[PDB]
Design a protein around this ligand. Sequence first.
Ligand SMILES: CC(=O)SCCNC(=O)CCNC(=O)[C@H](O)C(C)(C)COP(=O)(O)OP(=O)(O)OC[C@H]1O[C@@H](n2cnc3c(N)ncnc32)[C@H](O)[C@@H]1OP(=O)(O)O
Ligand SMILES: CC(=O)SCCNC(=O)CCNC(=O)[C@H](O)C(C)(C)COP(=O)(O)OP(=O)(O)OC[C@H]1O[C@@H](n2cnc3c(N)ncnc32)[C@H](O)[C@@H]1OP(=O)(O)O
Ligand SMILES: CC(=O)SCCNC(=O)CCNC(=O)[C@H](O)C(C)(C)COP(=O)(O)OP(=O)(O)OC[C@H]1O[C@@H](n2cnc3c(N)ncnc32)[C@H](O)[C@@H]1OP(=O)(O)O
Ligand SMILES: CC(=O)SCCNC(=O)CCNC(=O)[C@H](O)C(C)(C)COP(=O)(O)OP(=O)(O)OC[C@H]1O[C@@H](n2cnc3c(N)ncnc32)[C@H](O)[C@@H]1OP(=O)(O)O
Ligand SMILES: [Mg+2]
Ligand SMILES: [Mg+2]
Ligand SMILES: [Mg+2]
Ligand SMILES: [Mg+2]
Lengths: 128, 128, 128, 128, 127, 127, 127, 127
Amino acid sequence: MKLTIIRLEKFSDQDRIDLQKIWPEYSPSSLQVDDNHRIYAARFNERLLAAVRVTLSGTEGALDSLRVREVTRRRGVGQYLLEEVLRNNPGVSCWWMADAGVEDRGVMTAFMQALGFTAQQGGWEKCS
Amino acid sequence: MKLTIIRLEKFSDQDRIDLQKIWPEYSPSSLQVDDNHRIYAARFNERLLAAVRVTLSGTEGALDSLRVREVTRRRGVGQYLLEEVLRNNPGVSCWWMADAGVEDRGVMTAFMQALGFTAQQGGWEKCS
Amino acid sequence: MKLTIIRLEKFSDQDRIDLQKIWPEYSPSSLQVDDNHRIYAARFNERLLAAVRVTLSGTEGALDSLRVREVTRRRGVGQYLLEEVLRNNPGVSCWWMADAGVEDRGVMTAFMQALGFTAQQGGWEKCS
Amino acid sequence: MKLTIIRLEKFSDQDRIDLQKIWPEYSPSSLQVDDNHRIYAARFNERLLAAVRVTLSGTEGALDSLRVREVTRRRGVGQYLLEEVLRNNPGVSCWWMADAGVEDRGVMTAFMQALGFTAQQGGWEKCS
Amino acid sequence: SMIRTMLQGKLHRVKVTHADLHYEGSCAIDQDFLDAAGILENEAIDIWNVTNGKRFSVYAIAAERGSRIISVNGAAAHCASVGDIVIIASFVTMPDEEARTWRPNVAYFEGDNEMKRTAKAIPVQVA
Amino acid sequence: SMIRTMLQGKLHRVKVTHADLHYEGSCAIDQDFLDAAGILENEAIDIWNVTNGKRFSVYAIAAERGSRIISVNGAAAHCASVGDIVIIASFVTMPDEEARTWRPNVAYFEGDNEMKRTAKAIPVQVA
Amino acid sequence: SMIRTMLQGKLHRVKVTHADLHYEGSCAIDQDFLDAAGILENEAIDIWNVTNGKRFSVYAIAAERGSRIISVNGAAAHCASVGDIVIIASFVTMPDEEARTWRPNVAYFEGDNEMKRTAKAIPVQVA
Amino acid sequence: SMIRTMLQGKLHRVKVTHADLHYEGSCAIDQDFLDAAGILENEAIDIWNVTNGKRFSVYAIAAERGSRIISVNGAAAHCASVGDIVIIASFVTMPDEEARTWRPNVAYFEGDNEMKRTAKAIPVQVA
Ligand SMILES: CC(=O)SCCNC(=O)CCNC(=O)[C@H](O)C(C)(C)COP(=O)(O)OP(=O)(O)OC[C@H]1O[C@@H](n2cnc3c(N)ncnc32)[C@H](O)[C@@H]1OP(=O)(O)O
Ligand SMILES: CC(=O)SCCNC(=O)CCNC(=O)[C@H](O)C(C)(C)COP(=O)(O)OP(=O)(O)OC[C@H]1O[C@@H](n2cnc3c(N)ncnc32)[C@H](O)[C@@H]1OP(=O)(O)O
Ligand SMILES: CC(=O)SCCNC(=O)CCNC(=O)[C@H](O)C(C)(C)COP(=O)(O)OP(=O)(O)OC[C@H]1O[C@@H](n2cnc3c(N)ncnc32)[C@H](O)[C@@H]1OP(=O)(O)O
Ligand SMILES: CC(=O)SCCNC(=O)CCNC(=O)[C@H](O)C(C)(C)COP(=O)(O)OP(=O)(O)OC[C@H]1O[C@@H](n2cnc3c(N)ncnc32)[C@H](O)[C@@H]1OP(=O)(O)O
Ligand SMILES: [Mg+2]
Ligand SMILES: [Mg+2]
Ligand SMILES: [Mg+2]
Ligand SMILES: [Mg+2]
């Protein structure tokens, strides 16, 4: 089906294969999910194309490990994924993403700016 | 069906809903129709798009309350409606339309001129 | 069917109606046909579009009354009709067409020249 | 089927008719084929379009009688035929083609150069 | 330089007068009708048959002016019969900026191919 | 000067709200939907019907803004029924060099023709 | 800058000589026939089958000059059989002003693909 | 200024790997295959199905390079099944003088979508 942003609470075997391609550096389990430690992913034609980890602390929220599969970059997947994460967590007024693990900080900055985030020391913030 | 100009002698419930959209200022009944007090309307795909009231006094005829739904303006509906009113009342040699209620007199004038009417004080005349 | 040049030996009722349109000045019978007095016509989609009378005297042949219906001029009907008349009468080495009844002699001349005929006094000749 | 390069070990009647068109100067039999004396041909839609004779002597190989039907020249048939002959005889490190019978040596040279062969006295060589 | 494909004109609900597999393949149309819709002799046209649902593409040829003929000829005669009601359309291409203001040539018919109205626009369909 | 034919835009999985053989032949589309996909009044469109598999080409006309109408009218009503789920596409032509960077106007729908998302690209399908 | 789609040429009532699903998809046409109708190798063509009513679009490839071949190959062989009588057409685009004077390249056939006539116009159909 | 429609390229006898009505409507093609035939993401393509005879037009989207995917998605999945052998073609337009020397981009496949050959011409079919 069309590109859809989902919150992953249980992983199918296909989700595990796909998550391994998105994040070869993690080996899940290792991916504990609960009410405040969420994984959102972008699904298209029965496959995951991108994922992000979200940590919620009420009005403050943190994003890490945002990656879109290289093969499908610059097609609006990353933008839609973050837009949907923000829309589905309307209680958060301040979002932080650290620059950890980012392969190309200048591309990340231009993406984050497109999404309304400000560049700060160590990462990006959107604190409406 | 294709755009068709009809003379309304009885109103269906759909005609009443549509006439309310064309003329929200009238609340019919209030619309008495008889041999000399006629309503012509433009119908397209089972809906009325425009209507006009005609008062006949033999060789003299009067038009009032000409309105085409804003959504479908500048597609020849108003022109066809008046053309057909004139063609279907060949005994009338002098037609009058007063400027009453007209929202934009300069647009009305340009329309009426396109239909062969002359601008006069208080309205428009075509008196062949 | 496609444009076809036929030699008419018997006339159907449809041929009579069509021949009347091609030649309103003749009223057939009046059109005697025999071995040396032939009528060739151009047929398209079950109707005659053009006709010509041919008189044969062995190695000499004469054409008269060539007319293509005005509605279908300048579409190669006249050319094909005469080409086929010439091809189907290979024994004739000298052809004559008189200028009788021709409505526009300059158009006729340009047509006849296109078909290899020379303009002479009183008509056109092709005498290979 | 699509253009395919085949090694001919037995000839159908159709292969004989086609080979006669490719090589009218040979009258097969006369075409002995065995392990070292091979005929490769280009087949397209159930017909042979081009053929070449190959003589193998281990690491040395010789080509003669290369001809593509004139009707289908400059459509990549000759190139594909020789490419496939070379690929299917990977043990040969030195190939020779003599200039015998070639109708237009300058066209042959430009073809052979396109295939990586060098022009020499009496023919063309590719000796990797 | 983005080019749009736009409805050029249409003959709305003409009736087929002739349909014959042996006539020369084409759709022959009264010249008056061609002029009203802006359709040219030899132009590609699409035919949508309201009676039987078939949709097919051919090319136009002229029929005698005033004959009211709509003749579906040749292989196309598999797709329509005498008395079928058809829509005949032609499409043109133009640049995007011209397409935005384009007005197609529409002609409407009733009865035995009597032309009732020509127009330059189709109204908006309301709820 | 090699010219490509490219998807201009599409309405993805809209539902047919009206289908009537007697309505004027066309597909009438809510003006908001036309704007989202970049489709013009009078433009040629292709319709691919997911419910019944039929594929047909017609032209667009406008329906009242906000009505959510997708009305398959005239002969086209042989090809779709009320409640069918369709994809409506328009194609444009442009030169090869422009085609390489072209981004189509895509709009996605759920429910009763509620527009959920607009986008400028379709992702890559992975194994 | 309004561009028309016009009949470029046609092969009228040629007979299919070969039809094989395993041959390379295309319609192969005697080069003499291509020349007569102005059809190019690799050009898109429409085929209208008078025998069975099927209408399909493919592309032309050349067959040996003088072979009289009309070979319907590959998937197209689902749409025609040996001995079927077909019309093969190609369409070009040109500006409106050129379209008005355009003359298509028509070639007519009888028997076993014997070319009987070439022409530059189709007559008017009369009542 | 007479413009021809020419075969741009083709994927000859690829096999459908996926066919799903619920996938986003399109035909997704391994990027290597698109490159070999010169087909662009978002370009209009025709699909001719050798297995079942169906002929349909859609648009291309990319599939992961090296996946060998040919995915017939959405409404198009009514027209093909997994394991069907299809020809996928794209057409471009160009002026007559360029068309005469045009060479299309052809790619040939066997087995499980293994690309065997690319070429720039189709041979002449002989008697
Ligand atoms: C274990 C771990 O995961 S640690 C985290 C590791 N993550 C990384 O290293 C990030 C790797 N990069 C990515 O995953 C992606 O490139 C992302 C997330 C930065 C962007 O995702 P995409 O889906 O490619 O971006 P998307 O198409 O939605 O872009 C939206 C906008 O961002 C901007 N943008 C995106 N990519 C770029 C680029 N390469 N250059 C410039 N601007 C860009 C543009 O404004 C673009 O809008 P536009 O295309 O209309 O111009
Ligand atoms: C209770 C009561 O009803 S009181 C009466 C209230 N009525 C009003 O206030 C009138 C409101 N306006 C309208 O209803 C319409 O705008 C009308 C009747 C004036 C025109 O109806 P339309 O269907 O839009 O006009 P139509 O498309 O037939 O126009 C015919 C010609 O008129 C002229 N014309 C129409 N609208 C305009 C315009 N906005 N500007 C300039 N000229 C115009 C043009 O010449 C046009 O021909 P063209 O399009 O070929 O250029
Ligand atoms: C009772 C009786 O019938 S008496 C005889 C009465 N006959 C007449 O008055 C003749 C009336 N005119 C006609 O019937 C026709 O106009 C004809 C016979 C002259 C020409 O027939 P058509 O079918 O129109 O001509 P056709 O299309 O075959 O023309 C062939 C060539 O002739 C020339 N030609 C034809 N018409 C014209 C013209 N109007 N102007 C200039 N050249 C012309 C052209 O070279 C043309 O070739 P092209 O179109 O490739 O340029
Ligand atoms: C009994 C006997 O057979 S004796 C042997 C007799 N043989 C001869 O006389 C050879 C007759 N000629 C031929 O058979 C053919 O013309 C051949 C074999 C030379 C070439 O075969 P073709 O299938 O036409 O060539 P092909 O299309 O594969 O050409 C490949 C390349 O060669 C070159 N080439 C081929 N033909 C020509 C030409 N006429 N001019 C210039 N270059 C050429 C080009 O580089 C071409 O690549 P390109 O088209 O991308 O430009
Ligand atoms: Mg992306
Ligand atoms: Mg209007
Ligand atoms: Mg003529
Ligand atoms: Mg060749």
